[PDB]
C-alpha cells in the first residue's frame, strides 16, 4: 500500500514557524514529483508548491501567495517530504495535504489525510465533557477546548450508525461541539452507552456514560 502521513502541524503562535513532514512508503519515492496543498476550514483547495523528481534534480516551484516564505525539501534516503513555513499569519490556518503528483509507472495520484495548522495566540485547553440524557436519541456535550480537532466515538466506536457529530463553533477562544446518537429504545438503558472523547492537543481521553433520568 502507498502511504503518506503528514505530521508537524498543530497550534502555533503568529509569527512562529513550523516544519510539516510527510512520511511516505510503498513506491519509489525518487521517481515522483510531490506537492503540498492546503485548505482553510470551509474554503477552496490551494496549491502551495511542488518539488520535482530525481531526473529533474529535485527542483521546486511555489505559488505566488507563499513564494519567498515557505520552502519544500525532501529526504530522499528516508522517503520524506517537508514544508518549511515561516512567519505564520491567521491566513495560514488550514489543513495541509501532502500529495504524490506523478511520474513513471503503469497505474494513481494519492493524498494523505492532512494535518490541521491553527495560527493563534490562544492557548491549549482541554474539553469539559457532559452527558446528554433524555427509537431513543442520546448525546454528548464537548465544551471549552482549544484547539481543534477533537474526536468523539460512541462505545469505543461499536455504535457507528445513527451518529451525528456537529462541527465545532469557536467563541472567546474556546470551541464547543455536540454529538448525538440514536439507538433502539429497547437497548437503553439496559445495555450502556458511553461517549469517548479524545483531544490529542491536551493529551485528553475521557469516557462519559449516559446515565438515565
Amino acid at each position: 500500500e502507498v502511504k503518506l502521513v503528514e505530521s508537524g502541524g498543530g497550534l502555533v503562535q503568529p509569527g512562529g514557524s513550523l516544519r510539516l513532514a510527510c512520511a511516505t512508503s510503498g513506491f519509489t519515492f525518487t521517481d515522483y514529483y510531490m506537492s503540498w496543498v492546503r485548505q482553510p476550514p470551509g474554503k477552496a483547495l490551494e496549491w502551495l508548491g511542488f518539488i520535482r523528481n530525481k531526473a529533474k534534480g529535485y527542483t521546486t516551484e511555489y505559488s505566488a501567495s507563499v513564494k519567498g516564505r515557505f520552502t519544500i525539501s525532501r529526504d530522499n534516503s528516508q522517503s520524506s517530504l517537508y514544508l518549511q513555513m515561516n512567519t505564520l499569519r491567521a491566513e495560514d490556518s488550514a489543513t495541509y495535504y501532502c500529495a504524490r503528483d506523478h511520474d513513471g509507472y503503469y497505474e494513481f495520484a494519492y493524498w494523505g489525510q492532512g494535518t490541521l495548522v491553527t495560527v493563534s495566540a490562544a492557548k491549549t485547553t482541554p474539553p469539559s465533557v457532559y452527558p446528554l440524557a433524555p427509537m431513543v436519541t442520546l448525546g454528548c456535550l464537548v465544551k471549552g477546548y482549544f484547539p481543534e480537532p477533537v474526536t468523539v466515538t460512541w462505545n469505543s466506536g461499536s455504535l457507528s450508525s445513527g451518529v451525528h457529530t456537529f462541527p465545532a463553533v469557536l467563541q472567546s477562544d474556546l470551541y464547543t461541539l455536540s454529538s448525538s446518537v440514536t439507538v433502539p429504545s429497547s437497548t437503553w438503558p439496559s445495555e450502556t452507552v458511553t461517549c469517548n472523547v479524545a483531544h490529542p492537543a491536551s493529551s485528553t481521553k475521557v469516557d462519559k456514560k449516559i446515565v438515565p433520568r
Partner: protein, 219 residues
C-alpha cells in the same frame, strides 16, 4: 498565476439524474509539445481528502467509474456525471497543471431527496455541568430535508434570542439528510430562575412548528 473559475457554486439533483459543471481558465491550458490540455478534476467528499478523478481533461483515473466524464479544450472544460448516486455527494474542483498548478473555487454537489421531518430531541443541563455553574440546554434536529430550517427557543412562554449557538452538519451520504444542533447556554443562576424550556422548529414539512420542551420542576 493562472486563474481558474468554476460554476455553478452548487447544485442539487436526485439520485439517477445527469449533471454537468464547468470550469474556465484565464488562458489556454493546451500544450503545444504534447497536444494535451493540462486540466484535471478532483472530488472531495465531506470530511475526506480530495481524490483525482480525471486528468488531461478527459482521461479517467484507474479504478474510477465511467459515469464520470470530462470534456472541453483550450480555456473551457466540463465534468459530467451520468446517474448521480448518493455517494457522489462532494465538492468537485478543477485544477490546471499547464503552468504551476491552480485549483478552481469548487462546485458543491448536493443530493435531492424526499422531504423529511426533523426528529427533534431536547436535553436539559447535565448535573455535572451544573456542578461548575454552567448551564447548556441542547436541541438536536436530526435527519431533515430540505436543508433550510428555523429554530426558536422559548423560556416560560417568552422567546430567547441570545446565548444560542447553532451548528449544521454536511449532508449524510447514507440517507441524504441534514441535521442541526442548537445550544442555549446560560449561567446556573439564570437557569434555575425559570421553569419551562422549549425549542420550536420551523420546517417546510409543516405550518405548525415541531416543539419539544421540558419543565425544570419535573426533573
Amino acid at each position: 498565476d493562472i486563474v481558474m473559475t468554476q460554476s455553478p457554486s452548487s447544485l442539487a439533483v436526485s439520485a439517477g439524474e445527469k449533471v454537468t459543471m464547468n470550469c474556465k481558465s484565464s488562458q489556454s491550458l493546451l500544450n503545444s509539445r504534447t497536444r494535451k490540455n493540462y486540466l484535471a478534476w478532483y472530488q472531495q467528499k465531506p470530511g475526506q481528502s480530495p481524490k483525482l478523478l480525471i486528468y488531461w481533461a478527459s482521461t479517467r483515473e484507474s479504478g474510477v467509474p465511467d459515469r464520470f466524464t470530462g470534456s472541453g479544450s483550450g480555456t473551457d472544460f466540463a465534468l459530467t456525471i451520468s446517474s448521480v448516486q448518493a455517494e457522489d455527494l462532494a465538492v468537485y474542483y478543477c485544477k490546471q497543471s499547464y503552468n504551476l498548478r491552480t485549483f478552481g473555487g469548487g462546485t458543491k454537489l448536493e443530493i435531492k431527496r424526499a422531504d423529511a421531518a426533523p426528529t427533534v430531541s431536547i436535553f436539559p443541563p447535565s448535573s455535572e455541568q451544573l456542578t461548575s455553574g454552567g448551564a447548556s440546554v441542547v436541541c438536536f434536529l436530526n435527519n431533515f430535508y430540505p436543508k433550510d430550517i428555523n429554530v426558536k427557543w422559548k423560556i416560560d412562554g417568552s422567546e430567547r434570542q441570545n446565548g444560542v449557538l447553532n451548528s449544521w452538519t454536511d449532508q449524510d451520504s447514507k440517507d441524504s439528510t441534514y441535521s442541526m444542533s442548537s445550544t442555549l447556554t446560560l449561567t446556573k443562576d439564570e437557569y434555575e430562575r425559570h421553569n419551562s424550556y422549549t425549542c420550536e422548529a420551523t420546517h417546510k414539512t409543516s405550518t405548525s412548528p415541531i416543539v419539544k420542551s421540558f419543565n425544570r420542576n419535573e426533573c
